[PDB]
Amino acid sequence: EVQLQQSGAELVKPGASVRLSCSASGFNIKDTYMFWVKQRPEQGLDWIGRINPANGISKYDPRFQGKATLTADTSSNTAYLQLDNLTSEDTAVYYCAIEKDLPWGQGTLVTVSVAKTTPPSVYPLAPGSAAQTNSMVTLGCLVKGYFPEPVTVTWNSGSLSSGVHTFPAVLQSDLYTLSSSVTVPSSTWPSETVTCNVAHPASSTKVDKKIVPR
Amino acid sequence: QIVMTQTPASLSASVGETVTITCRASGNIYNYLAWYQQKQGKSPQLLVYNAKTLVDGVPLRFSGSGSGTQYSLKINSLQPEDFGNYYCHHFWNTPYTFGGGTKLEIKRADAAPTVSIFPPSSEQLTSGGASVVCFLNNFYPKDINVKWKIDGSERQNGVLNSWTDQDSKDSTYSMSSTLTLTKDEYERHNSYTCEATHKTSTSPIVKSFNR
Ligand SMILES: C[C@]12CC[C@@H]3c4ccc(O)cc4CC[C@H]3[C@@H]1CC[C@@H]2O
Numbered sequence: 001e002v003q004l005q006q007s008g009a010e011l012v013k014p015g016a017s018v019r020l021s022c023s024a025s026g027f028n029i030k031d032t033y034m035f036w037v038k039q040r041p042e043q044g045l046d047w048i049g050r051i052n053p054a055n056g057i058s059k060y061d062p063r064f065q066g067k068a069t070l071t072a073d074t075s076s077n078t079a080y081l082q083l084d085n086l087t088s089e090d091t092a093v094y095y096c097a098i099e100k101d102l103p104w105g106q107g108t109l110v111t112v113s114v115a116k117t118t119p120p121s122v123y124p125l126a127p128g129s130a131a132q133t134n135s136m137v138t139l140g141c142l143v144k145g146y147f148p149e150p151v152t153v154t155w156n157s158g159s160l161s162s163g164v165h166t167f168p169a170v171l172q173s174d175l176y177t178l179s180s181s182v183t184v185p186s187s188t189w190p191s192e193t194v195t196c197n198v199a200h201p202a203s204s205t206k207v208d209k210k211i212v213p214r
Numbered sequence: 215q216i217v218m219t220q221t222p223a224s225l226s227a228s229v230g231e232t233v234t235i236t237c238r239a240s241g242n243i244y245n246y247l248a249w250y251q252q253k254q255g256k257s258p259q260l261l262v263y264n265a266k267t268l269v270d271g272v273p274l275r276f277s278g279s280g281s282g283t284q285y286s287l288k289i290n291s292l293q294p295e296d297f298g299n300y301y302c303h304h305f306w307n308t309p310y311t312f313g314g315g316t317k318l319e320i321k322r323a324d325a326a327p328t329v330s331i332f333p334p335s336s337e338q339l340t341s342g343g344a345s346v347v348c349f350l351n352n353f354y355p356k357d358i359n360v361k362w363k364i365d366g367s368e369r370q371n372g373v374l375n376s377w378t379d380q381d382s383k384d385s386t387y388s389m390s391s392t393l394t395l396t397k398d399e400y401e402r403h404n405s406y407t408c409e410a411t412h413k414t415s416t417s418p419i420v421k422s423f424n425r
Pocket residue numbers: 098099100101248260263303304305310
């Protein structure tokens with residue numbers, strides 16, 4: 001299929017440089033004008049540059065001229081973006097795209113920071129003993145004390161889709177805290193089994209904490 | 215360089231409502247513009263390019279228009295899934311500047327927060343901290359305040375609140391209020407309380423546990 005895959009997310013200390021690799025599949029970049037976009041946490045879309053892989057002449061927005069470098073090789077269609085002297089003002093989601101009707105890349109998150117990577121402790125949120133029998137109940141998972149973004153919280157390995165709510169983690173002393181709830185009928189709980197599964201790639205840690213009554 | 219100024223900054227309209235988002239260019243961009251819809255956490259979606267041209271698969275309700283410096287996107291018969299951010303992309307020349315983005319909320323009939331309170335997790339206790347969580351699911355409008363009555367007196371020291379985006383269907387929100395205490399502080403108090411005062415009931419929604 002005709003689609004682009006960007007590199008994995010990376011954690012970089014301030015000052016260093018990153019080479020992001022956007023791999024296109026199903027077509028050839030030597031015949032497409034590629035460009036990149038920046039997006040700060042909660043902020044807008046910034047145009048970083050543009051490039052024609054064939055010859056290699058790239059145009060940039062003056063703002064990024066001093067740190068962004070669009071480079072592309074046809075040998076493997078892998079477009080690159082080198083970011084020099086990284087500062088916090090760079091921590092953002094960088095997208096890869098082509099100047100045509102083809103969906104952008106999934107974006108590569110570049111988290112510029114000094115904080116060492118830490119695995120999330122997931123805590124099961126079960127009711128403190130209240131008449132739960134009432135149509136449906138609501139239990140949750142509180143994942144906290146982890147860095148860096150992102151993480152993956154799912155209920156019963158994707159089985160539980162409806163009624164799941166995951167909240168955009170919040171920073172604190174450089175650590176994050178995120179939570180998720182699930183509304184399952186009074187029936188499935190606790191006759192059935194329901195547990196959240198949270199995965200944190202950056203630490204190669206995955207975890208299953210069983211939601212059992214107190 | 216051609217700077218793009220888009221308006222309105224934030225917006226709200228109900229299902230079925232025709233809307234018009236506008237992007238005005240400092241210099242004539244000769245129809246070289248494109249509108250993108252970015253739903254939270256996802257990648258921009260191309261809706262319209264070359265001024266009026268709509269992408270394949272994009273629902274006929276999304277209309278694009280404009281001329282010279284003024285360009286407008288018109289979403290006729292608004293639908294619940296049309297919420298999110300919208301940007302305009304100029305590419306008459308470099309740099310291909312973006313617009314400021316338009317926020318879009320979906321007007322829906324008010325709904326009240328289904329409050330739930332969960333005392334600290336059995337395990338967490340041993341670490342030396344205790345987060346009492348209260349989930350207030352499926353309400354609207356986002357305008358809402360919860361308060362933490364510790365035992366008798368009021369608490370507001372050390373609380374994290376987060377709101378999800380609008381649901382794909384019921385356009386409702388949700389909030390995760392977390393009062394993070396320390397083992398001892400939690401061990402020296404009983405009736406922790408989550409009082410939700412929302413614009414739907416003069417009598418506040420109250421859920422609490424006694425320990
Ligand atoms: C990629 C853009 C949207 C898609 C546009 C397109 C879309 C289809 C096509 O056949 C040609 C072009 C040329 C310019 C492209 C634009 C350049 C700026 C914008 O982001």
